[PDB]
C-alpha cells in the first residue's frame, strides 16, 4: 500500500491505499463519503464528479494515489457550517432540479466549478457546461433553472429568465 | 397571525394543487440519501458474476479451482450448488422460468454462469477472471420472423415437451404464447368489404430503461435468528418478499425486505434478477452479508429490455375518413426466457388499448411471443404494460391512413374522436375509458402551435426544396393519445395471484403530527412529498407535520409497488379513503365535545364548526389530543386508519402532443424546432412534480425515437450496450419543452386524479416518429422505422435518389 | 470496471521517466491524463504491471513561442489549450477543435500528448496535427528525435513511437496572420468520437486560395492528411465546382469502419460533407 | 394500551404492542394469545415493542399492566381479524356468516362439516380473491380502554 | 500504549491499549464482543465474567495488558462452529434460566468452568459455585435447573 | 469505575522487581491478583503512577514443607491453596478459611501474599497467620528480613513493610498431627468481609487443652492475636467456665468499626460468639 495525505472538505486526511483503488471507491468505501455515485463504467455519466485542485474531475477515472497532496470538495462539503445550504443546493430544491437524486451530487459539484469558470452563463453555456453529467429523471430543463437561480443568488442580480 | 382566515389556513397546509417543494431534496442535495451501495454491514462480502461470452452454447465444464484458491475468496457458486436446491431456475412474473446460473447451456450473451464471493469488489473481479468455461457453440437465433421456421434452433430444451405454457398452447418450440382479443369475425368482414384498407408493419425497436443507478442488493441472513434482511433496488418490495418466501422457504415474518432510496427505476427494477437470488443464497451459506452491485455493461445487456414489437397494423375506412375497424397482429420478441412483467392474465399487457382515442365499432388484436438468444424483458421504460406500443401502432396508423386518403391527419383525428358525452366509453377491445375531452385539448394544442399556419409554412418549404433552394425538410408530428394506468380491478388484475390493490396507513400522534405509510415505492416520483399533500387537505394538518414512508416490508402496509403509473390511482386513492376514515372519527369526537349532532357540524379547512355558531368549533389538532386525553365513551382511544383500495377501473389520462422537426436530407441530421405537450391527468396534486415527470418522459421519448437501441448481430453478440453507443442525451441534445394541461377528472377516483408518470413517453415517441415520417411524406418515403438517427435518415434519402 | 493490480511510479524528470519506461518494458505505460488508459484498464483490455505517472514533471506542461513555431508540452491539458489567449490569437483552430473533444471533466485531465500518442483513429488531435504539419518531439534511451505528425500513424493503435520513448512536445508552425480555419465534426452526441470530421487551414489573396491543408478524422484506421484535396483548392475561388474536385479526392482516401455511427459508405460521404462545410467556414474567416 | 396485528398472504404474522418488556417474556406470550384466537402457530408470529415509529401508541410496561391492557387489546384485535375471516369464509362457501362456526383453525358450515376454510386459506383469499364488498388484506388494530382494574 | 497479542474465541487478536483500559472495555468497545456486560463498579456482580486461561475472571477487575498472551472465551465463543447451542445455552433456554438476559453471558461463562471443575455437582455445590454471579430476575432456582440439565446432556455425550 | 492513567511493568525476577520499586518510589505499587488494588484504583482512592506486575516471577508461586514449616509463595492463589491436598493434610485450616473468602472468580486471581500485605482489616488471612504464628519473608534493596505476622499490622493500610520491599513468602509452623482447627466467620452474604471472625488452633491430651491460639478478624483496625484468651484455655477441659474466660479476654481487646455490618458493641459480642463456636469445632476435631 501507498501512504497518502490530502485535504477533503477542508479537513486533513491521511490514509493507506492500493495503487489500483479508484478515487471514487476511496471516497465512498474508505472515507464513507457516499454522496458521490457510480453510474457507468465508461466515464460518461459524471455521477462521480468531485472538485479537485480547482478542477471538475470524474473520480471513477482517477486512482486515489493520483490525489496525493490534493484538495478535494465533495457534496458533503458544500453546505455552510451553520446548516444553511449553498446557493446551488437551494436552487436545485427551489427549481425542482432533482427527482431520484442520483445524479445530484455530481451535478452540483460540476456546477460549483462552472459558476467559478463563468459566473454569469447563458442557457447555452449552462447546457454545454454540464455536458459531462447525465440525468435520467429531469430532462435537464429544471437543472438549467437551478443553476440560473444559484448564479443570480451569488451575483446579487438576475441574468436570463 | 393568531386567527388566520380560511384561505390562510388552507395555504399553510401546502396540500392538494400546491407546488410544494420536495422533502426528499434536503438529504439528496447533501449526499445523505441512502441507496443500496451506501450500505455497509459488519463482515459484509461482495459477489459478482462470471458471465457468458457466447449467445448460444452448451457448457462442457466450468473450472473454478484457480478462483477458489485466491486469497480473500469465500465462495464460487455454479448451477451445481443451486440445482440440489431447485434454485438453478427462478420463476418469472410472466409464468415462465429464467436460469439463475447456467446449467447445461447458455442462451444469451452475458448470461450468468458462476457467482464469486470475496472480501471486496476488487478481489471478486480478480477471481472472476480466473474461472475457465468451456463452451460448445450452437446455431444462434436472433431474427424473430424466423423463430418458428421448421429448422429454427431449439433454444428451450428445458421445456421441449411442454406444449402448454403459462398462457395457453404453444405451436412451435420457440413459441411462447398466442393471445387474442376482439371480434375476429366482425373485424375480418369489415376489412373484406371496406372502401379503403390501410396496412403497414411498424417495428418498435429494442431499447432499455437504463436507470442511472444499476440493479443491486445487500443480502444478510442472520443465522443466529433465522431471519433474512434484504436491502435492494425493488419497485415492488412486498412482491419481492412474497417471492423470496416461496423460493427460499423462509416465512414472510422472517424476511425483512428494505427498498431504501432508489436512483431511478423506469421499470428496470420491478422483477427479480439472478444477482438477488445468488446474493441471498451466498449469505445463507456463509452466514455473513453479501453485497451485489452490477456495472453498466451488465445492466444494459442482461436486465429488462423494452419494446421489440413487430406490429402489422391495419385501419379500414370510408373515403371520407370515417374509421370502420382496426386489425393488428404483433410478433413479440421476448428473448430467451419470458420474464415480461405484466398482470398474470395479460401476456401482451394492455396492448388492447390500441384503438386509441377513436370511436370505432369493431377491432381485433393478436399477439405471438417468441424466444430468441437475447436478454429477457419487454415491459419496462415507461410502457404502462405495452401501452407505448399500442399508442405507437394507432398514432402511426392514423398518419399512414391520412396519407392514403389524401387528408390532413389532424382533420382525420377530429372526425373520429370519442366525444366527451360518450364517456364512460366501452372501446372495441374491452376497456371502458373513464372520462375525456379530446376536442378541447386538440384545439388548444393546435391553437398554441399555430397548426394551420405551420401547414402553409411546410407547403412553402416543400416548394422551395423542389426549386433547389434548401436541403432542409420540415415535419409536423402529432400524437393524440389515451393512456390506461392504475392496475387494477381484482376481477382481472393480479401479480402472480395477488390482486392489484394498494394501501395506506395513517397514524395521528397526541400532539397532532403524523406518520403515514403506503404499499408503493418511489424511485424519484416525489411520493414522500405528494402523499402528504393528499392527507393535508383531507385532514387540515399541514403537510410538513406528516412523515411519509415506503419500502420496508416489516412496517409499510402490503401493496403491489410502483409501476404502471399506478401510485396515484391506487395508493393515492387509499390515502384519501384512510384519511376520510380518520375525519369521520374526528367528526364523532367533535360532536361529543361540542354537545351537538354530527349533522349540525360543518368543516372549515381544519376544524369542525357548529352550523350557525362558528364560535363553537374544534380543530383537527384539538381532536387528535382529545382522542388520547378524553376518548368519548363509545370510541377507541387514538386516531388512525388503514385502507386497502381495490380500484373499480383503471384511469385514462390523455394528451395532445405536437412537434416541429427540421431535417437535413444530405447528412440525415434532424433537429427539433418546437415540442408542445398537453397532458390531462384529471385533478393535479402537485403541478411542479407533474411538470418534472413530463420533462423526464419527453426526454426519454426523444432518445428512443431518435437514437437509442440495443442490437444483436447474426452471431448473437449484443451491440451498443454501453454509453459509448447507447444514446442517452446530455443537456446539449435535449430539446426545450413546452407543457400545458386541461382538467378532466376521473369520476371513480376519490380525489378525481389519474396517473401521469408514463404519459410523456407513451405519447412522445409517436409524436417524434410522426414528425420525421411527416417530413418525408411529400417525397413518398413510406413508413420509416425507428430510430431516426443520422445514418438511417441519410439512407432514406439515398434510396429516394436525393443525393444524386 | 476494476483494473488489475499494478505498481505506481512518480518520476521527477523526463530523464527519469524515460529510464523507467525503458527498464520496465511493455509492462509499464506512461500515465498522463488517464482518460483513455484508465477506461481500458477498467475493462482489462489493458493490464499493465506498472504505471509511470508524469504528473510531477513540470517541464511537460506548457505553451511556448520558439522560432517560427508554437511548442506545446505533452502534458498540457485540453482545458489549458482552450484557455490560452496566445493560442487563440495564433492558432485559433486548436480551441475550436478542443471544444469538440469529450466534456468539461475529461478536458480538465486529458492531455494533448495523450490525445496524439494514443493511436485511436477516433481522437481529434491527430488529423488536426497532420493538417497543421506539426512535428512530434520524442525522447528515449537513445536520445531525442522528431517525427512528422504526417508520418506518425500507421494503423489503429499502431504508431511510430519506439520502446522507452516519451512524446515530450508538439511543435507547430505558426500559420500566416489572418489565415482561415475550421474544424467541422459530425457526432452522435456530446462526448462521441466523430462519424467524420474535417480540419482545414487555408489562406486567401484577392479572391483566390493561396494555401490549403485538410485533415480527416475517424474515416480510416488512422487520421488522414488529404494532400490532393487541399492541393486542388489552391488557385481557385473555393466555389462549388472547386469543392467538388476536393471532395472526390478526399473521399477516395477514406476507408471507414462500419459501426454504430453507420456504414462505411455513409461515413465516406460525411467526410466529403464535413470538408465542404469546413472549407466554407474557413473561407469566411480568411482575410 | 394497544395492539396491531397484520397477516401476510402466506399466513405468517407481524404484531406490535404499545407496552415494553424488560424481561417479562412479551415477545413469547403475546404470540400465544394470538395463536389461540386465530389457530396460527405461535412461531409463525413476530412480536415487536419499543420503536415509537412502528408500534401503536401505548402507555408502557409498569403496574403489571401489560396483560390487563395490551393483552386485552391483542385478543380484541385478533377477534376483529377473526370476524373479517368469517365474512371471507361466508363469501367463499356461499353461505350466510350466521351459518358458520369456528373450529380451532377453520370455519365450518353448520351441519355440513366437510365444507370449511382454514385461517391460512382465508388469509390467502384476502389478497388473492378479496370479496368485492370488503377491502383486501387481513389485519386489525385495537386501542383498549379497560373498564376496571384487575385484582389478582 | 502497549502492544498486546492474545486469542479470543479461538482467533488471534493484536491491539494497542492504554495500560489502564479494563479488560471488559477492551472486549466490548475495541473488540465489539458485546455479550459480556457491566452490572457494577465494585467487582460483585459477575456479569463481566469470561473464561481466561482455564479460570473464571471478572473482566472488570483486570486490565487488558494483564491478558497479554492469554486465551479468552466469551459468550460468543460458546456455540459450536455449526451454530449448535452448547449444552449450557440449551439448558438455560429449556429450564427458563433467564428473563432480561443481562446476567446470562456471565452466568453461562462461569457455569462452563464450574462444570469442568466439577462435572456432577449437587445443588449446594452449584449455588456456592455461582456465588460470584448476581441475577435480578430469576431468583436462581431455574438457573440451578439449567446447570443440572446441562450436566446431564454433557455426561451423556461420550 | 475508571482509574487514572499509569505505566505498567513486568519484571522477570524478584531482584528486578525490588530494583524497580526502589527506583520508582512511593508512586509505584506491586500488582498481584489485583482484586484489592484495582477496585481502589477504579474509585481513585489509589492513583499510583506505576504498577509492577509480579505475574512473570515463577519463584513467587508454590507450596513446600521446609524443616518444621510450610513455606507458601506470595503469588500463590486462593484457588491453589484450596486445591492443595498437601496443605489440607498439614494445615487444613487454610482451605477452610480460603473457602470463606470472596467468590470463585476472585479466588482464581487473588493471592495469599496480596491478602496478607494489603492492610485492609477486612482481609481474612492476616488474623489466621497470627493464629498460626506465621512469619513473613520480605526482600528489599537492603536484603532479606523476617517480620512475624503478629508484629506486621499497625492500622488500616499501615504495615511493617518498608519502601521497595516485596513480601516473597509466608513461613508457617506446622501444628502437630491431630490438632484441632477452625475458622468461623459471620458475614452478611457471600463475598462480604466479616462482621467478625475467629481463627483457632489447639491441641488436646487426656481430655485437656495443651496448646491454644486465637486470631480475630475485622474487629479492630488491624487483625488481632488474642494472646490472653488462648492462654486461659490451656490446662482446661474447654468447658463452659473456660470458654467464658476466653471470650472475656478476647472481647476486651476488640475495637470494631460501626458500619453496615452493625455497631461496635454487636461486633465485639460477635467476636466472642465466633470464638466459642470455633473452639467447639476445633475441640471436636482435636
Ligand atoms: N394527477 C396527478 C398524477 C400524478 N401526480 C404526482 O406525480 C407523481 C407520479 O405519480 P403517478 O403518475 O401516479 O406515477 P407513479 O408515482 O406510480 O410512477 C411510476 C411511473 O414513474 C415514471 N417516472 C419516473 N420518474 C423518476 N424520477 N423515476 C422513475 O423511476 C420513474 N419511472 C417512470 C415509470 S416507468 C413509472 S411506471 C406522484 O408524486 C404524484 O402525486 C400529481 O401531482 N397529480
Ligand atoms: S461513474 Fe460515470 S463518469 Fe464516473
Ligand atoms: S435526478 Fe435522477 S438521474 Fe438525475
Ligand atoms: S461488572 Fe460487576 S463484577 Fe464485573
Ligand atoms: S436474567 Fe435478568 S439479571 Fe439475570
The CATH number of whichever domain residue B121 belongs to comes to: 3.90.1170.50
Q: Where are the alpha helices (DSSP H) in B644-756?
A: 687-706
Spell out the residues 6+ positions from residue A146 whose beta carbon is closer than 8 angstroms to its own: A88, A91, A92, A94, A95, A97, A111
Is residue F7 located within the same domain as residue F65? Answer: no
Nearest 5°: the CA angle B422, B424, B426 is: 85
Give CA B45 to chain center in angstroms: 32
Task: Identify whether the C-beta of residue A97 lies closer than 8 Å to the C-beta of residue A110.
Answer: no
Known active-site residue B98: no
Cell readout for B613 is 355558531
Q: Does A61 touch chain C (CB under 8 A)?
A: yes
Task: Identify whether the C-beta of residue C170 lies closer than 8 Å to the C-beta of residue C146.
Answer: no
Is residue F157 located within the same domain as residue F238? Answer: no
* Domain end (from B650, B681, B714): B650
What residues in C contact B129, CB-CB < 8 Å?
44
Distances (CA, A) of B505 to B303, B550, D140, F16: 33, 11, 11, 74
Is residue B269 located within the same domain as residue B313? Answer: no
DSSP per-residue codes, C206-270: TTEEEEEEEEEESSSSS-EE-HHHHHHHTTS---HHHHHHHHHHHHTT-----BTTB-HHHHHHH
Nearest 5°: the CA angle C107, C112, C115 is: 85
Is residue C90 located within the same domain as residue C169? Answer: yes
Q: Classify residue B468 as exposed, middle or buried by CB count within 10 Å of its CB (0-12, 13-18, 19+).
A: exposed
Is residue A140 located within the same domain as residue A152? Answer: yes
Establish how many alpha carbons lie within 13 A of residue E147's alpha carbon, considering only the half-sphere containing its beta carbon: 29
Beta bridge mates, B222: B227
Nearest 5°: the CA angle B683, B685, B687 is: 100
DSSP per-residue codes, A84-151: PPPHHHHHHHHTT--SS-SSHHHHHHHHHHHHHH-SS--HHHHHHHTTT---SSS-SHHHHHHHHHHH
Query: Shortest CA distance to B566 belongs to which of B493, B514, B498?
Result: B493
Task: Give the phi and the psi of residue B593 in degrees, each rounded to 5.
Answer: -70, -40
What 8-state DSSP symbol labels residue E150?
Answer: H
C143 is in an annotated binding site: no
Cell readout for A144 is 438549467
Is residue E3 located within the same domain as residue E44? Answer: yes
Spell out the residues 6+ positions from residue B11 whose beta carbon is closer than 8 angstroms to its own: none
Q: Does E100 touch chain D (CB under 8 A)?
A: yes
- Is the minimum distance from the CB of E132 to ligand 4 under 6 angstroms? no
* Domain end (from E54, E77, E100): E77
- Length of chain F as a residue count: 286
Distances (CA, A) of C20 to C9, C12, C51, C162: 9, 11, 10, 14
Give the pairing type, strands B498-499 and B502-508.
Answer: unpaired
Q: Does E69 touch chain D (CB under 8 A)?
A: no
Number of domains into which chain E is organized: 2
Known active-site residue B235: yes
Query: Shortest CA distance to F37 belongs to which of C87, C124, E61?
Result: E61
Is residue A90 located within the same domain as residue A71? Answer: no
Q: Could D24 and E101 be called an inter-chain contact, meaning their C-beta atoms sit closer than 8 Å?
A: no
Is residue E96 located within the same domain as residue E48? Answer: no
Task: Identify whether the C-beta of residue C132 lies closer than 8 Å to the C-beta of residue C172.
Answer: yes
Q: Which of A66, A70, A125, A133 is best to mutate for the C interface (most C CBs within 10 A)? A: A66
Q: Does E16 touch chain F (CB under 8 A)?
A: no
Resolution of the structure, angstroms: 1.5
- Is the minimum distance from the CB of B527 to ligand 1 under 6 angstroms? yes
Query: Shortest CA distance to B113 belongs to which of B71, B81, B137, B157?
Result: B81
Query: Shortest CA distance to B267 belongs to which of B110, B115, B353, B385?
Result: B385
Query: Shortest CA distance to B380 belongs to which of B93, B101, B90?
Result: B93
Task: Give the phi and the psi of residue A119 in degrees, each rounded to 5.
Answer: -65, -15
Q: Could B557 and D137 be called an inter-chain contact, meaning their C-beta atoms sit closer than 8 Å?
A: yes
Distance CA(A6)–CA(C46), nearest Å, equals 29
Range of the domain at B83: 5-139
For residue A104, the CA-to-ligand 3 centroid distance in Å is 6
Q: Which of F35, F49, F105 is best to mutate for the E interface (most E CBs within 10 A)? A: F105
Task: Identify whether the C-beta of residue C159 lies closer than 8 Å to the C-beta of residue C74.
Answer: no
Give the pairing type, strands C7-9 and B711-712.
Answer: unpaired
Query: Please, do chains D and A touch (3+ CB pairs < 8 Å)?
Result: no
Beta bridge mates, B664: B472
Helix (H, G, I), strand (E, B) or coil at B33: coil
* Binding site members of B for Mo-molybdopterin cytosine dinucleotide: 758
Distance CA(B758)–CA(B770), nearest Å, equals 19
Query: Please, do chains C and F touch (3+ CB pairs < 8 Å)?
Result: no
The secondary structure of chain E in percent helix, strand, coil, rounded to multiples of 5, reads 40, 15, 45
Give CA E123 to chain center in angstroms: 20
Q: Which residues of F59-72 are buried (b: 16+ CB within 10 A; e: fewer)?
A: ebbebeeeeebbbb
Is residue E55 located within the same domain as residue E92? Answer: no
The 3-state secondary structure of B138-204 reads CCCCCCHHHCCCCCCCCCCHHHCCCCEECCEECCCCCEEEEEEEECHHHHHHHHHHCCEEEEEEEEE
Is residue A70 located within the same domain as residue A82? Answer: no
Helix (H, G, I), strand (E, B) or coil at B690: helix
Q: Could A61 and C8 be called an inter-chain contact, meaning their C-beta atoms sit closer than 8 Å?
A: no
At A72, which CATH number?
Answer: 3.10.20.30
- Is the minimum distance from the CB of B524 to ligand 3 under 6 angstroms? yes
The 3-state secondary structure of B556-567 reads CCCCCCCCCCCC
* Domain end (from A77, A110, A133): A77
Is residue C127 located within the same domain as residue C189? Answer: no
- Length of chain A as a residue count: 161
Residue nearest to atom 42 of ligand 1 (CA): B685
Task: Identify whether the C-beta of residue D145 lies closer than 8 Å to the C-beta of residue D59.
Answer: no
Task: Identify whether the C-beta of residue B305 lies closer than 8 Å to the C-beta of residue B207.
Answer: yes
C111 is in an annotated binding site: yes
Query: Shortest CA distance to C66 belongs to which of C86, C88, C45?
Result: C86
Spell out the residues 6+ positions from residue B595 whose beta carbon is closer than 8 angstroms to its own: none
Annotated catalytic residue: which of B14, B109, B235, B693?
Answer: B235
Spell out the residues 6+ positions from residue B228 whose beta carbon is closer than 8 angstroms to its own: B219, B220, B221, B222, B244, B248, B250, B254, B255, B256, B280, B283, B284
DSSP per-residue codes, D20-58: --SSS-HHHHHHHHHHHHHT--GGGEEEE---TTTSPP-
Is residue A7 located within the same domain as residue A64? Answer: yes
Query: Shortest CA distance to C203 belongs to which of C150, C282, C128?
Result: C282
B31, B38, B732 member nearest A128 (Cβ) = B732
Q: Which of E35, E77, E79, E83 is best to mutate for the B interface (most B CBs within 10 A)? A: E83
Is residue B642 located within the same domain as residue B704? Answer: no
**Nearest chain E residue to F33, by CA:** E62
Give the pairing type, strands F63-66 and F69-73.
Answer: antiparallel
Is residue A88 located within the same domain as residue A144? Answer: yes
Range of the domain at F32: 1-54
The C-alpha torsion from F163 through F166 and F167 to F169, rounded to 10°, is -150
At B330, which CATH number?
Answer: 3.30.365.10
Range of the domain at E118: 78-158
Distance CA(A35)–CA(A105), nearest Å, equals 6
Cell readout for B161 is 415437451
Give CA E49 to chain center in angstroms: 5
Task: Give the phi and the psi of residue F228 in degrees, each rounded to 5.
Answer: -65, -35
Task: Give the phi and the psi of residue B123 in degrees, each rounded to 5.
Answer: -65, -40
Query: Shortest CA distance to B553 belongs to which of B193, B230, B109, B178?
Result: B230
For residue C260, the CA-to-ligand 5 centroid distance in Å is 71
Task: Identify whether the C-beta of residue E93 lies closer than 8 Å to the C-beta of residue E107.
Answer: no
Is residue A91 located within the same domain as residue A67? Answer: no
Task: Identify whether the C-beta of residue F157 lies closer than 8 Å to the C-beta of residue F121.
Answer: no
Cell readout for E63 is 486490565
Helix (H, G, I), strand (E, B) or coil at C173: strand
Is residue B602 located within the same domain as residue B643? Answer: yes
Distance CA(D32)–CA(D27), nearest Å, equals 9
Residue nearest to atom 2 of ligand 5 (CA): E100
C5, C188, C273 member nearest B727 (Cβ) = C188
Give the pairing type, strands F28-31 and F50-53.
Answer: parallel
Give CA B715 to chain center in angstroms: 31
Is residue B225 located within the same domain as residue B112? Answer: no
Is residue A66 located within the same domain as residue A82? Answer: no
What residues in E contact D25, CB-CB < 8 Å?
99
Q: Does C39 touch chain B (CB under 8 A)?
A: no
**Nearest chain E residue to B225, by CA:** E83
Amino acid at each position: 500500500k501507498a501512504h497518502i495525505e490530502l485535504t477533503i472538505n477542508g479537513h486533513p486526511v491521511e490514509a493507506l491505499v492500493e495503487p489500483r483503488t479508484l478515487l471514487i471507491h476511496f471516497i465512498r468505501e474508505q472515507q464513507n463519503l457516499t454522496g458521490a455515485h457510480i453510474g457507468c463504467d465508461t466515464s460518461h455519466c459524471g455521477a462521480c464528479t468531485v472538485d479537485l485542485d480547482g478542477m471538475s474531475v470524474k473520480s471513477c477515472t482517477m486512482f486515489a494515489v493520483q490525489a496525493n497532496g490534493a484538495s478535494i470538495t465533495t457534496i458533503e462539503g458544500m453546505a455552510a457550517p451553520d446548516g444553511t445550504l449553498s446557493a446551488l443546493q437551494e436552487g436545485f430544491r427551489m427549481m425542482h432540479g432533482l427527482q431520484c437524486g442520483y445524479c445530484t451530487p455530481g451535478m452540483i459539484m460540476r456546477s460549483h466549478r462552472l459558476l467559478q469558470e463563468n459566473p454569469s452563463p447563458t442557457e447555452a453555456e449552462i447546457r454545454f457546461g454540464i455536458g459531462g453529467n447525465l440525468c435520467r429523471c429531469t430532462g435537464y430543463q429544471n437543472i438549467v433553472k437551478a443553476i440560473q437561480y444559484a448564479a443570480a443568488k451569488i451575483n446579487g442580480v438576475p441574468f436570463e429568465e | 397571525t393568531v386567527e388566520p382566515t380560511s384561505a390562510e389556513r388552507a395555504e399553510k397546509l401546502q396540500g392538494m394543487g400546491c407546488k410544494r417543494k420536495r422533502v426528499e431534496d434536503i438529504r439528496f442535495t447533501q449526499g445523505k440519501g441512502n441507496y443500496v451501495d451506501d450500505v455497509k454491514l459488519p463482515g459484509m462480502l461482495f459477489g459478482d458474476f462470471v458471465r457468458s461470452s457466447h449467445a448460444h452454447a452448451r457448457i462442457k465444464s466450468i473450472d473454478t479451482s484457480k478462483a477458489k484458491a485466491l486469497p480473500g475468496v469465500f465462495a464460487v457458486l455454479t448451477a451445481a450448488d443451486l440445482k440440489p436446491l431447485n434454485l438453478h431456475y427462478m420463476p418469472t412474473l410472466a409464468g415462465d422460468v429464467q436460469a439463475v446460473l447456467a446449467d447445461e447451456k447458455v442462451l444469451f450473451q452475458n448470461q450468468e454462469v458462476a457467482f464469486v464471493v470475496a472480501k471486496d469488489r476488487y478481489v471478486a473481479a480478480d477471481a472472476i477472471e480466473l474461472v475457465e468455461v468451456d463452451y460448445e457453440p450452437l446455431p444462434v437465433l436472433v431474427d424473430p420472423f424466423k423463430a418458428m421456421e421448421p429448422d429454427a434452433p431449439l433454444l428451450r430444451e428445458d421445456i421441449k415437451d411442454k406444449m402448454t405454457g403459462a398462457h395457453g398452447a404453444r405451436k412451435h418450440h420457440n413459441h411462447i404464447f398466442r393471445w387474442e382479443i376482439g371480434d375476429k369475425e366482425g373485424t375480418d368482414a369489415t376489412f373484406a368489404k371496406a372502401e379503403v384498407v390501410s396496412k403497414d408493419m411498424f417495428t418498435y425497436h429494442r431499447v432499455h430503461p437504463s436507470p442511472l443507478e444499476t440493479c443491486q442488493c445487500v443480502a444478510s441472513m442472520d443465522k443466529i435468528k433465522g431471519e433474512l434482511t434484504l436491502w435492494g433496488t425493488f419497485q415492488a418490495p412486498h412482491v419481492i418478499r412474497t417471492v423470496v418466501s416461496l423460493i427460499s422457504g423462509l416465512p414472510e415474518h422472517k424476511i425483512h425486505v428494505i427498498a431504501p432510496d432508489i436512483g431511478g427505476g423506469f421499470g428496470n427494477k420491478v422483477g427479480a434478477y439472478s444477482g438477488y437470488v445468488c446474493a441471498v443464497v451466498a449469505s445463507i451459506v456463509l452466514g455473513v452479508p453479501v453485497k451485489w452491485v452490477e456495472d453498466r455493461m451488465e445492466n444494459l445487456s442482461t436486465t429488462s429490455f423494452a419494446r421489440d414489437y413487430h406490429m402489422t397494423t391495419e385501419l379500414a375506412a370510408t373515403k371520407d375518413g370515417k374509421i370502420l375497424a382496426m386489425r393488428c397482429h404483433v410478433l413479440a420478441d421476448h428473448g430467451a426466457f419470458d420474464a415480461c412483467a405484466d398482470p398474470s392474465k395479460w401476456p401482451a399487457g394492455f396492448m388492447n388499448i390500441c384503438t386509441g382515442s377513436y370511436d370505432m365499432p369493431v377491432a381485433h388484436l393478436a399477439v405471438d411471443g417468441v424466444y430468441t438468444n437475447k436478454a429477457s424483458g419487454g415491459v419496462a421504460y415507461r410502457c404502462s404494460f405495452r401501452v407505448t406500443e399500442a399508442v405507437y401502432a394507432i398514432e402511426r396508423a392514423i398518419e399512414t391512413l391520412a396519407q392514403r386518403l389524401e387528408m390532413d391527419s389532424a382533420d382525420l383525428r377530429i372526425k373520429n374522436f370519442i366525444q366527451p358525452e360518450q364517456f364512460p366509453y366501452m372501446a372495441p377491445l374491452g376497456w371502458e375509458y373513464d372520462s375525456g375531452n379530446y376536442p378541447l385539448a386538440m384545439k388548444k394544442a393546435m391553437d398554441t402551435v399555430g397548426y394551420h399556419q405551420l401547414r402553409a409554412e411546410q407547403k412553402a418549404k416543400q416548394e422551395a426544396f423542389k426549386r433547389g433552394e434548401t436541403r432542409e425538410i420540415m415535419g409536423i408530428g402529432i400524437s393524440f393519445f389515451t393512456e390506461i394506468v392504475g392496475a387494477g380491478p381484482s376481477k382481472n388484475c393480479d401479480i402472480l395471484g395477488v390482486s392489484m390493490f394498494d394501501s395506506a396507513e395513517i397514524r395521528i400522534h397526541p400532539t397532532g403530527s403524523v406518520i403515514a405509510r403506503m404499499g408503493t415505492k418511489s424511485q424519484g416520483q416525489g411520493h414522500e412529498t405528494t402523499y402528504a399533500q393528499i392527507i393535508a387537505t383531507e385532514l387540515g394538518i399541514p403537510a410538513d407535520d406528516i412523515m411519509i414512508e415506503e419500502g420496508n416490508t416489516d412496517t409499510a402496509p402490503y401493496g403491489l409497488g410502483t409501476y404502471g403509473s399506478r401510485s396515484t390511482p391506487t395508493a393515492g386513492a387509499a390515502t384519501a379513503v384512510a384519511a376520510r376514515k380518520i375525519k369521520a372519527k374526528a367528526q364523532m369526537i367533535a360532536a361529543h365535545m361540542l354537545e351537538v349532532h354530527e349533522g349540525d357540524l360543518e368543516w372549515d379547512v381544519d376544524r369542525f364548526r357548529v352550523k350557525g355558531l362558528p364560535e363553537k368549533f374544534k380543530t383537527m389538532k384539538e381532536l387528535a389530543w382529545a382522542s388520547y386525553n378524553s376518548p368519548p365513551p363509545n370510541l377507541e382511544p387514538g386516531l388512525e386508519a388503514v385502507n386497502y383500495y381495490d380500484p373499480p377501473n383503471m384511469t385514462y389520462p390523455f394528451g395532445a402532443y405536437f412537434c416541429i422537426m427540421d431535417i437535413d436530407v444530405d447528412t440525415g441530421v434532424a433537429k427539433t424546432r418546437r415540442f408542445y405537450a398537453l397532458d390531462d391527468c384529471g385533478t393535479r396534486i402537485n403541478p411542479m412534480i407533474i411538470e418534472g415527470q413530463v420533462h423526464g418522459g419527453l426526454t426519454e421519448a426523444f432518445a428512443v425515437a431518435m437514437g437509442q437501441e440495443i442490437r444483436y448481430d447474426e452471431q448473437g453478440n449484443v451491440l451498443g450496450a454501453s454509453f459509448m453507443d447507447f444514446f442517452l442525451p446530455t443537456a446539449v441534445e435535449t430539446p426545450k419543452w413546452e407543457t400545458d394541461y386541461t382538467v378532466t377528472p376521473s369520476p371513480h377516483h376519490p380525489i378525481g386524479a389519474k396517473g401521469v408518470g408514463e404519459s410523456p413517453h407513451v405519447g412522445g415517441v409517436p409524436c417524434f416518429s410522426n414528425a420525421v415520417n411527416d417530413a418525408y411524406a411529400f417525397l413518398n418515403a413510406g413508413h420509416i422505422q425507428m430510430p431516426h438517427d443520422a445514418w438511417r435518415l441519410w439512407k432514406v434519402g439515398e434510396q429516394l435518389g436525393l443525393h444524386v | 470496471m476494476i483494473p488489475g493490480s499494478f505498481d505506481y511510479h512518480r518520476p521527477k524528470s523526463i530523464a527519469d521517466a524515460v529510464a523507467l519506461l525503458t527498464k520496465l518494458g511493455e509492462d509499464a505505460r506512461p500515465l498522463a491524463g488517464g482518460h483513455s488508459l484508465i477506461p481500458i484498464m477498467k475493462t482489462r483490455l489493458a493490464t499493465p504491471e506498472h504505471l509511470v505517472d508524469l504528473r510531477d514533471i513540470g517541464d511537460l506542461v506548457g505553451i511556448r513561442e520558439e522560432g517560427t513555431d508554437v511548442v506545446i508540452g505533452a502534458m498540457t491539458t485540453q482545458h489549458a489549450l482552450i484557455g490560452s489567449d496566445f493560442l487563440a490569437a495564433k492558432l485559433p483552430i486548436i480551441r475550436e477543435t478542443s471544444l469538440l473533444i469529450a466534456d468539461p471533466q475529461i478536458r480538465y485531465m486529458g492531455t494533448i500528448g495523450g490525445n496524439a500518442a494514443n493511436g485511436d483513429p477516433g481522437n481529434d488531435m491527430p488529423a488536426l496535427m497532420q493538417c497543421l504539419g506539426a512535428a512530434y518531439e520524442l525522447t528515449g534511451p537513445e536520445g531525442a528525435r522528431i517525427v512528422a505528425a504526417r508520418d506518425y500513424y500507421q494503423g489503429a493503435y499502431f504508431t511510430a513511437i519506439e520502446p522507452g520513448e516519451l512524446l515530450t512536445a508538439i511543435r507547430i508552425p505558426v500559420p500566416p496572420t489572418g489565415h482561415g480555419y475550421a474544424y467541422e465534426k459530425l457526432k452522435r452526441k456530446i462526448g462521441d468520437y466523430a462519424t467524420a470530421a474535417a480540419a482545414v487551414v487555408l489562406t486567401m489573396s484577392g479572391g483566390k486560395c493561396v494555401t490549403a491543408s485538410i485533415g480527416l478524422t475517424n474515416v480510416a484506421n488512422t487520421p488522414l492528411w488529404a494532400e490532393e484535396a487541399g492541393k486542388v483548392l489552391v488557385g481557385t475561388a473555393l466555389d462549388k465546382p472547386a469543392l467538388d474536385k476536393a471532395v472526390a479526392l478526399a473521399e477516395a482516401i477514406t476507408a471507414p469502419a462500419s459501426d454504430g455511427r453507420g456504414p462505411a459508405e455513409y461515413r465516406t460521404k460525411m467526410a466529403g460533407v464535413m470538408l465542404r462545410r469546413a472549407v466554407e467556414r474557413a473561407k469566411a474567416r480568411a482575410k
